[PDB]
Design a protein around this nucleic acid. Structure first.
Length: 68
DNA sequence: GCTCTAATCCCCG
DNA sequence: CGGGGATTAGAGC
């Protein structure tokens, strides 16, 4: 890469659609990840890196534990 | 030096 | 297609 890494500055409005989706679908297809990007003014890869970090930081805080 | 977590590398099927 | 752990990265204590 050329621009190093941006990191963070997600707004609370993005989290309020992303978490409300993660409680009904933990593994969305690109056809749905682009819709989540329309509702937030993001793009599909931004939703995908949030979703794999959500599963990875579930594991890197709890490994198996869920309350759902 | 250490946490916390996003942006990405390499691997898996 | 894209998940999963390792990894590189970034701001606060």
């Amino acid at each position: 890469g050329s621009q190093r890494r941006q990191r963070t500055h997600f707004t609370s409005q993005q989290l309020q659609e992303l978490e409300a989706t993660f409680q009904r679908n933990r593994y969305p297809d690109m056809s749905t990840r682009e819709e989540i990007a329309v509702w937030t003014n993001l793009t599909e890869a931004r939703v995908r890196v949030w979703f794999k970090n959500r599963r990875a930081k579930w594991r890197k805080r709890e490994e198996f534990i869920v309350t759902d």
